[PDB]
Amino acid sequence: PLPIQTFLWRQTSAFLQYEASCVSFERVLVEWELVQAALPHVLHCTATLLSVAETKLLHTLHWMLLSMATVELFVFLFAPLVHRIKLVIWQPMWEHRQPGVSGFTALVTYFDVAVLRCLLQPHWSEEGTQWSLMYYLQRLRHMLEELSVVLKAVYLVLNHDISSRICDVALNIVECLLQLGVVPNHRLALTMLIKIVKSLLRHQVFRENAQNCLTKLYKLQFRQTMRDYVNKDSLNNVVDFLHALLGFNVEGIIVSAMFKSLITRCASTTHELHSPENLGLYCDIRQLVQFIKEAHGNVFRRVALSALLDSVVNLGAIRQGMKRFQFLLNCCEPGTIPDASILAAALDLEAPVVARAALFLECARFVHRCNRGNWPEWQKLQWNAAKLFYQWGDAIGVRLNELCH
């Protein structure tokens, strides 16, 4: 470094005129340590101007080219410019291959580490991202033709925002890494898969690939991490995930592992739930639970009767089970959640008497509310519930007669 540095800054002050500046800009450089020291200004200003001078700046850069921070700056400013320049570096770079300059193409990888480190930026211009991701895809393919930090970077960039192009390229690269066998980390990969599938003729093919990757990953903790994710992440995303997965085996295990915690967490939100703005969301959940009951979830019975399956008596567990039962019963099809058989058989089940009595009195209160007039806040279903109630009563009476008599 020498007192001349101010002159260099002056050049930036011209770019940060369009025609006049290029004359002296080319002259002073045309007329190795000084070249290296001056390269950052030239890279910055040419990137700024590009975002007849084009040819002059390109020639200046080529003359300059013919340490990690330098490549870092190079990538940050020139990655989005690839598609617009339309040669040793540009032509290979159009196909997402390493540039041919020997300055940093050499192997100790400088370009790779540069792109990886700078890609962590939260608001990189999207144009560059699409390139960088494709580059990684290509490199991974080359690896398969003849890395956890890459997964970490992809995960850190995915959360900020997702798009059709971004999600497609992310799915492709994640599939390529799974094919490579990077996973022996598991939590990150599963979370990335969740994020990718959360936003999905064109879409189905990738979706089929999505569940294929999910099945491949299933072979190797899954339940624990999923149970953590469902509670940690906001409901809207969880319900969107379930809608995408099902649409209204992997589905069996995921539901059997997640439904209990989903109901548990959603139960303690009634005040937010009733607010009209979010009412639409509730509708989705209804379908979800209905589907779980329709033909899929036998776990529904076990989750519904949790209060007496997880059993001095444990007050907290039974209270949580009853909270879940309250949410489920008041959710859909009044008088349909507990069938006649379960109520009739509840007398003899080898479970704490308190739980059975609580279930009976809760059904009693539900029937009382139905009588008073206030069904769930929304008919033929009114008449149907009468038949279900009569079946309940007949079964209970038959059981009582058989037992006592």
Curated annotation (Swiss-Prot):
Q: Kindly list the cysteine pairs connected by disulfide bridges.
A: none
What superkingdom heads the lineage? Eukaryota
Q: Which family does it belong to?
A: Belongs to the unc-80 family.
Gene name of the encoded protein = UNC80
The record describes the protein's role as: Auxiliary subunit of the NALCN sodium channel complex, a voltage-gated ion channel responsible for the resting Na(+) permeability that controls neuronal excitability. Activated by neuropeptides substance P, neurotensin, and extracellular Ca(2+) that regulates neuronal excitability by controlling the sizes of NALCN-dependent sodium-leak current. UNC80 is essential for NALCN sensitivity to extracellular Ca(2+).
Q: Which disease is it linked to?
A: Hypotonia, infantile, with psychomotor retardation and characteristic facies 2: An autosomal recessive, neurodegenerative disease characterized by severe truncal hypotonia since birth or early infancy, progressive peripheral spasticity, and profound psychomotor developmental delay. Some patients may have seizures.
Q: What is the name of the protein in this document?
A: Protein unc-80 homolog
Tissue specificity annotation:
Moderately expressed in fetal brain, spinal cord, skeletal muscle, thymus, spleen, fetal liver, small intestine, colon, kidney and uterus. Highly expressed in adrenal gland, prostate and testis, as well as in brain and cerebellum.
UniProt's post-translational modification comment states:
Phosphorylated on tyrosine residues.
Q: How does it assemble?
A: NALCN complex consists of NALCN and auxiliary subunits, UNC79, UNC80 and NACL1. These auxiliary subunits are essential for the NALCN complex function. Interacts (via N-terminus half) with NALCN; this interaction facilitates NALCN surface localization. Interacts with UNC79. UNC80 bridges NALCN to UNC79.
Its taxonomic placement starts with:
Eukaryota, Metazoa, Chordata, Craniata, Vertebrata
Cellular location(s): Cell membrane
